[PDB]
Design a protein around this nucleic acid. Structure first.
Ligand code: K
Ligand code: K
Ligand code: K
Ligand code: K
Ligand code: K
Ligand code: K
Ligand code: K
Ligand code: K
Ligand code: K
Ligand code: K
Ligand code: K
Ligand code: MG
Ligand code: MG
Ligand code: MG
Ligand code: MG
Ligand code: MG
Ligand code: MG
Ligand code: MG
Ligand code: MG
Ligand code: MG
Ligand code: MG
Ligand code: MG
Ligand code: MG
Ligand code: MG
Ligand code: MG
Ligand code: MG
Ligand code: MG
Ligand code: MG
Ligand code: MG
Ligand code: MG
Ligand code: MG
Ligand code: MG
Ligand code: MG
Ligand code: MG
Ligand code: MG
Ligand code: MG
Ligand code: MG
Ligand code: MG
Ligand code: MG
Lengths: 147, 261, 184
RNA sequence: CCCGUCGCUCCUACCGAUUGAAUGAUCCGGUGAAAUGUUCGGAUCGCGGUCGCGAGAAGUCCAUUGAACCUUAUCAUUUAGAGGAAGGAGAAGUCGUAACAAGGUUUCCGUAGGUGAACCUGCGGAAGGAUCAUUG
RNA sequence: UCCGCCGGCACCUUAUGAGAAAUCAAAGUUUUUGGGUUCCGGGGGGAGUAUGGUCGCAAGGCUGAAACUUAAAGGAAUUGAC
RNA sequence: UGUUACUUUGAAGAAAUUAGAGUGCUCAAAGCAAGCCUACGCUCUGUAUACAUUAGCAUGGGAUAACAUUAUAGGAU
RNA sequence: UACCUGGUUGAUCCUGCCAGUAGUCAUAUGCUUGUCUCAAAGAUUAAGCCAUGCAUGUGUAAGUAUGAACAAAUAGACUGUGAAACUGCGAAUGGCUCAUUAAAUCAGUUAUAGUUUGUUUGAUGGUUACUCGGAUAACCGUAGUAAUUCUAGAGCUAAUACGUGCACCCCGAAAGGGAUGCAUUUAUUAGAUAGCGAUGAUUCAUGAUAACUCGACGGAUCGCACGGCCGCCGGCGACGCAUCAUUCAAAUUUCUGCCCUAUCAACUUUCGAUGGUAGGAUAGUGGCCUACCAUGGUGGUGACGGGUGACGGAGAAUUAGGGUUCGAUUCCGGAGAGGGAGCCUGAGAAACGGCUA
């Protein structure tokens, strides 16, 4: 099961030992799994609504809100645990020569278990509060490469 | 800095105050109050620079310390009190009463009021939410909090406030077709009819306003202030009536004035 | 003193950060409370930013614990720390921290259970007690530890911040998870 | 017109034994003030019924932050140095005559050896040659 | 042997072209300035020297300064003198 | 609902400085004043406006250009 | 003003530099100098060292007067003025400087649904008490020391100082009892649908319930005016406590953007480097820190390191256009107070005209 850490992982505020049944109640009540819509036209993946993973940093089932800048890029590294490096490609204008030069920036981003990603895939990241020393973004959508 | 700044350098003061740059090294630092420091007019400016009643910083203190000036029906003795948009300033000795309204060039104008019209003001609703004990309340952009508001009142609406009973007399819902005034930005002081509302999720909302002469200009929702329902404002406007003339048109009027005057 | 600034840290690239200012008071830290279980209660008042107050508990012996399934909360004595997911060394030192698994006295809850269900683990009174007994269900694992007089509980408060050690009685799969860790 | 050695004076830089020197910074290590938290301690004061209750200094214990000093090490900058040795400048030094004419052995490039000095010679190459030319 | 096509090493005449000119059918289509792209130069010396790095058994190769010095050095062409 | 660059318009955007409108400090560099008539005053006196790379935000345009995509359609209906 | 001229030859056309020409809110220096207006001025080398003086104190009708203080009056608590002293507040602004600092500061542009915020402004604070207790300053009088707003002991007496204190649910023989303001801490529960609020988006605002805390909270304060009912009731203010919103702000934070150097090509990670889980700490997010686990993170699109006689910007000089150079200095932001470090007070300081080493 998802219980792989030394502590017992559970969603805060969801009581799993209630005598009554959660049938016919909203998410997060009656022991039902909690999930939410982040707005901005993004859809909640089915893997997050019907999943069993616990991730307090998940934008859909965690305790993090999306607000600020929405960015897009390509997955550059997917070797960390629930974190990826997103490469953003842009052109920098050189004024004196009236021409452009290719530049890039690596933006660390948290990816919830509901998303499947591989190097080269296109991802959309929404800004959130600092999650680590360098992570300030959360993956919101993944488009497989060649699709 | 290790705390709060208590001084305002004269060149750093808001431009709409129209303070001469060589008048001194400092400008009146607006005190905390209902209006923001960048969107207000301190009483010292009003009494000395606008009305000429006081000739010096010292004389303003004398006038206020005699309790001869009232803002929104209450006596104010603070020289740097932040009087702002729609505030009513009353001077019983001179029998004068003014409302702070932006002229078409974006500067505060002391619009003289009649005695009857000086008994109320317009306020823009900031938000409506439940307070302690589940009691609903609304707060405005002039620092006022009103409990038990009408359930129909929502954010961005305008409420007519009576300065005597201190109660909401009437309110205007924020909707397309009403007459509004711009209270900030490039188009500050312009009056027109709200024609459209463009919403952008997660971003500022843009509102398109059409002038009575057909001129259309845009601005942010935060800079709009509804003045009346339909096309008639509930308050008296200055001579310009929010009509912004081009520099060519303004120059044309000046040339004609010299010929006649 | 203790500081929470990032100046001393390396950059994400690995390069060093040359210092450009001294430590600020608004980014300070303080010594850990290291709250311990002891009958000599001691909580020291700490003045924090803004003139507010924090309560730092050095020693605690009782806590306010809630039985979630029964929706009853009672003050009970803290007996022992049995498991800690962060550092096992905090268990043998009997340190009270949030999310630590502890054993609490079961006596306060037994009295309520007898007073509520009329069971050990006046005409109108018996009328309702039997009515409530129809929908009475008690977990076997939870009942087994009532005999010993100790209930496994998890601390949900922060003794070093609020000065109190409150929690809830373990039950359901959470109880199964932790009791397996203690089965050695 | 003009090349180099040698001889004389001056200027700039380089090499150089001296485990060169000085100065500054940094790393590790050692020692470690003060403060804070903790432990113990209970001078002393107050309040109740010669026992209790409360407050509490000096000092002490452990930990934390951590100046400062002292090693080795590394780096940076500046600098002395017997002697060796490069370049340049300095009206009118010595020895030749290598380059410019087919410059009197056509010149030059790469490479190798040799000679007071320019230079000489071997091998391959170039014309920037002194030949745009033999269907004779 | 004759005509023609594509490709190659070149040559001859010519200026409507270019260039400081010698000369070039490209070294042309450039102040009427822009097809794409790589390398590379910034007065003459000091100097392809010093130093560090790197390659080589060595010979040396590749990379490569400064102090200082100097009003010229140099390219093409013209008339003389030799 | 493939993603961008580009372009158009707009919103936001400190003052001072720069450009610039008005104004006879005697001129000028400046300043932000003043003007009008002769009353217990007036002109609601004036203290405009433009510019402000790049990046970001929002409308219109889709030529040029970049990336992505295509036939065992996981196609459209 | 979209400009050139001298210099290589016997003479010529070139390349090419040297020299000349003009400006600088550009410094120094030389000589000269009548008037008006305007005006920079120990930045550059030494953020080197400093004699002396001054630069932060503060009183309203409204906290506390028995000066053995003054003035004016004449059996009363005081109630004309008021030094001193306690209490309160401020001294975290301003001013000065540019040493450190190269994605750092900073600029435009974001976020706080990630926090604190004296004050201002608005609203909101339940159904011995005819007023408690003990101290202390000024004052008074014994003093010590070479000496300092260095210091000890005794006698007095105040408070808006200090310490106190009137101030629906459960149990149940439906009586009675418990809890019952606000705040604090935890858990359960509601917060719909398309009675029931808001957002692009929150188990959010907020409600109910079970308990919890040894809660600086819920006025033992002051001025003026005197009235209305027959002892009762009552006006206009001042000051203060708590909560929310607001204002004044901070902190942290998103995206893009910075000069020379490769004779700097690898750097980071035992002792945090990148990320995960659980805690600790913080006003709060976060390797900010601890334990455990994973092996990541950056780099010719120049990481890392080095140089800067490098604070950044608004801007300044010169500019046909493009551009080049400069930006210590009055506006904004940051940083420092001989070098480090630590800390108290406080709403706010890692403060230096505060303290400790
Ligand atoms: K600050
Ligand atoms: K020869
Ligand atoms: K020859
Ligand atoms: K030979
Ligand atoms: K041919
Ligand atoms: K203060
Ligand atoms: K910024
Ligand atoms: K910058
Ligand atoms: K934190
Ligand atoms: K972590
Ligand atoms: K204070
Ligand atoms: Mg300051
Ligand atoms: Mg928003
Ligand atoms: Mg010869
Ligand atoms: Mg011969
Ligand atoms: Mg010869
Ligand atoms: Mg030819
Ligand atoms: Mg060209
Ligand atoms: Mg050269
Ligand atoms: Mg030019
Ligand atoms: Mg000559
Ligand atoms: Mg020159
Ligand atoms: Mg005092
Ligand atoms: Mg550097
Ligand atoms: Mg950045
Ligand atoms: Mg809630
Ligand atoms: Mg954490
Ligand atoms: Mg660790
Ligand atoms: Mg600079
Ligand atoms: Mg510097
Ligand atoms: Mg500057
Ligand atoms: Mg400097
Ligand atoms: Mg200065
Ligand atoms: Mg400044
Ligand atoms: Mg400081
Ligand atoms: Mg000094
Ligand atoms: Mg200090
Ligand atoms: Mg000083
Ligand atoms: Mg100071």
């Amino acid at each position: 099961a998802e219980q792989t850490e030394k502590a017992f992982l559970k969603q805060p505020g969801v009581f799993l030992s209630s005598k009554k049944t959660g049938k016919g109640k909203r998410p997060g009540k009656g022991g039902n799994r909690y999930f939410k819509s982040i707005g901005l036209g993004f859809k909640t993946p089915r893997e997050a609504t019907e999943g069993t993973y616990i991730d307090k940093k998940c934008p859909f089932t965690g305790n993090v809100s999306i607000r600020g800048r929405i960015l897009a890029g390509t997955c550059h590294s997917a070797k960390m645990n629930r974190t990826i490096i997103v490469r953003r490609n842009y052109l920098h204008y050189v004024k004196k020569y009236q021409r452009y030069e290719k530049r890039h920036s690596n933006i660390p981003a948290h990816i919830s278990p509901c998303f499947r990603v591989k190097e080269g895939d296109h991802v959309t990241i929404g800004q959130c509060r600092p999650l680590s020393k360098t992570v300030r973004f959360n993956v919101l959508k993944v488009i497989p490469a060649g699709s | 800095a290790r705390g709060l700044k208590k001084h305002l350098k004269r060149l750093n003061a808001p431009k709409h105050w129209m303070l001469d740059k060589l008048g001194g090294a400092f400008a009146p630092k607006p005190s905390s109050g209902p209006h923001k420091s960048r969107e207000c007019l301190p009483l010292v400016i009003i009494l000395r620079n606008r009305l000429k009643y006081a000739l010096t910083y010292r004389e303003v203190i004398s006038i206020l310390m005699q309790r001869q000036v009232m803002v929104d029906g209450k006596v104010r003795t603070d020289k740097t009190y932040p009087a702002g948009f729609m505030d009513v300033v009353t001077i019983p000795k001179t029998n004068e009463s003014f409302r702070l309204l932006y002229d078409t060039k974006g500067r505060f104008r002391l619009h003289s009021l009649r005695d009857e019209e000086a008994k109320f003001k317009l306020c823009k609703v900031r938000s409506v939410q439940f307070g302690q004990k589940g009691i609903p309340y609304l707060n405005t952009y002039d620092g006022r909090t009103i409990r038990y508001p009408d359930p129909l009142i929502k954010a961005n609406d305008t409420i007519k406030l009576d300065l005597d009973s201190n109660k909401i007399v009437d309110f205007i819902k924020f909707d397309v077709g009403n007459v509004v005034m711009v209270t900030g930005g490039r188009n500050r002081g312009r009056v027109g009819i709200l024609k459209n509302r463009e919403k952008h999720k997660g971003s500022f909302e843009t509102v398109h306003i059409q002038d009575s002469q057909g001129h259309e200009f845009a601005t942010r929702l935060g800079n709009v202030f509804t003045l009346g329902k339909g096309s008639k404002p509930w308050v008296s406007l200055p001579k310009g009536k929010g009509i912004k003339l081009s520099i060519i048109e303004e120059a044309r009027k000046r040339m004609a004035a010299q010929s006649a005057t | 003193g203790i500081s929470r600034d990032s100046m001393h840290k390396r950059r994400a690239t690995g390069g060093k950060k040359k210092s450009w200012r001294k430590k600020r008071k608004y980014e300070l830290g303080r010594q850990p409370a290291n709250t311990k279980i002891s009958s000599n209660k001691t909580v020291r008042r700490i003045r924090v930013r803004g003139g507010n107050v924090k309560w730092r508990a050095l020693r605690l012996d009782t806590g306010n614990f809630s039985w979630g399934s029964e929706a009853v909360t009672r003050k009970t004595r803290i007996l022992d720390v049995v498991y800690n997911a962060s550092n096992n060394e905090l268990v043998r030192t009997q340190t009270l921290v949030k999310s630590a698994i502890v054993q609490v006295d079961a006596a306060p809850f037994k009295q309520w259970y007898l007073q509520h269900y009329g069971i050990d683990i006046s005409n109108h009174v018996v009328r309702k007690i039997e009515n409530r007994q129809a929908d009475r269900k008690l977990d076997s694992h939870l009942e087994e530890q009532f005999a010993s007089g100790r209930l496994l509980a998890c601390i949900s408060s922060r003794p070093g911040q609020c000065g109190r050690a409150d929690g809830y009685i373990l039950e359901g799969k959470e109880l199964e998870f932790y009791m397996k860790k203690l089965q050695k």
